[PDB]
Paper text:
The NIMA-related kinases (Neks) are a family of Ser/Thr protein kinases, first discovered in Aspergillus nidulans that are conserved in eukaryotes. [name] is 1 of 11 Neks found in humans, and contributes to the assembly of a robust mitotic spindle apparatus. Human [name] is a 34.5 kDa protein, comprising a singular canonical kinase domain made up of a small, 5 β-stranded, N-terminal lobe linked to a larger, mostly α-helical C-terminal lobe. The intervening cleft between the two lobes forms the ATP-binding pocket and active site in which phosphoryl transfer takes place.
We, therefore, obtained crystals of Nek7WT apo and Nek7WT.51 in the same form as the Nek7SRS. All three structures have four chains in the asymmetric unit, and in each case, chain D has a poorly ordered N-lobe. The analysis, therefore, focussed on chains A–C. In contrast, the side chain of Y97 adopted the ‘up’ position in chain A of the Nek7WT.51 structure, and was poorly resolved in chain A of the monoclinic Nek7WT structure and was not modelled. These conformational differences might be explained by crystal packing interactions: chains B and C of the monoclinic structures form a symmetric, back-to-back, head-to-tail dimer that covers the surface proximal to Y97, whereas this region of chain A is exposed to solvent. A comparison of the apo-Nek7WT and Nek7WT.51 structures indicates that the presence of compound 51 does not alter the conformation of the R-spine. Although there might be a stabilising effect of compound 51 on chain A, as the side-chain of Y97 is clear only in the presence of the compound, this might also simply reflect crystal-to-crystal variability. The orientation of the substituted phenyl group of compound 51 is clearly different between the two structures: when bound to Nek2, the phenyl ring lies flat against Gly92, and the sulphonamide-amine substituent points towards Asp93; when bound to Nek7SRS or Nek7WT the phenyl ring is rotated so that the sulphonamide-amine points towards the N-lobe where it interacts with the side chain of Arg50. Dose-response experiments with Nek7WT and Nek7SRS demonstrated that a Nek2 inhibitor, compound 51, successfully inhibited both enzymes. The apparent IC50 values calculated in these experiments are 79.01 µM and 40.13 µM for Nek7WT and Nek7SRS, respectively.
Residue numbers in the entry: 19 to 183, 199 to 300
Write the structure that this text describes.
Amino acid sequence: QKALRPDMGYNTLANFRIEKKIGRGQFSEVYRAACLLDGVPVALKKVQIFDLMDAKARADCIKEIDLLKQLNHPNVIKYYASFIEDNELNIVLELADAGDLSRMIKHFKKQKRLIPERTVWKYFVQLCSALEHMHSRRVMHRDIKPANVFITATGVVKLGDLGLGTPYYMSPERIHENGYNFKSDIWSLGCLLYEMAALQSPFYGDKMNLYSLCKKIEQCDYPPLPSDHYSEELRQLVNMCINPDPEKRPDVTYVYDVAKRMHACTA
Ligand SMILES: CN(C)CCCNS(=O)(=O)c1cccc(Nc2nc(OCC3CCCCC3)c3[nH]cnc3n2)c1
């Protein structure tokens, strides 16, 4: 406990008491922390740009989180502040109480119980409005994975803003190094919906090889879903969002539209 300056709000580590290390970080170190000013709890990602990032990388790296600031939407986590302290770069964002979707898929795979299509839309639909908002404002969520989709005790899904520029869901464009574009978010969004209904990524196997993995991705050879429990509309939707050719994947809005229609049907 050091001199807490209340005039800097959430812009100093001196106004937060770190509770626990709630984050898994090869590149990060998130913490469940509590503020000493208004007591609101928050998460605190401790990025290690220190020397691991060149000045040119740092500049744009901070330029993007400033854009992350430019987004308010219930289904995406909010950016409360960011600052350099200890030469680390600390980012404080909203904490989600309940837990992680990645931590829940293994939960259902643990109980050998599938996820009914009724709920898959209950969560997916929120995740599309969220992404639609980022795409609405030309923001590109660069790492959509189950380990970045958290739910609140209420049940709202908070999308986790990360970024750059093995990732969980690799893109066809990124294998060829063609470039990450808006429809590359449609890719991971597709594979994600697949993972909720199949309890595991689309392109996988006991091999664990790196070569065969993408030769499948550009080919699009994934194990079809069980039509007994998942509608044709679902199985088809994800089949479109992972078409290797980006230009043949749907706009973010269309995915949101389809997700909306069937959320009503499935309730
Ligand atoms: C096992 N359980 C019963 C223990 C109780 C558990 N309670 S808990 O303490 O509040 C708890 C535990 C875990 C998650 C969360 N919610 C959360 N976690 C984040 O970091 C996750 C990390 C960051 C990216 C890569 C890997 C995942 C967030 N980052 C931004 N917002 C976040 N919100 C809360």
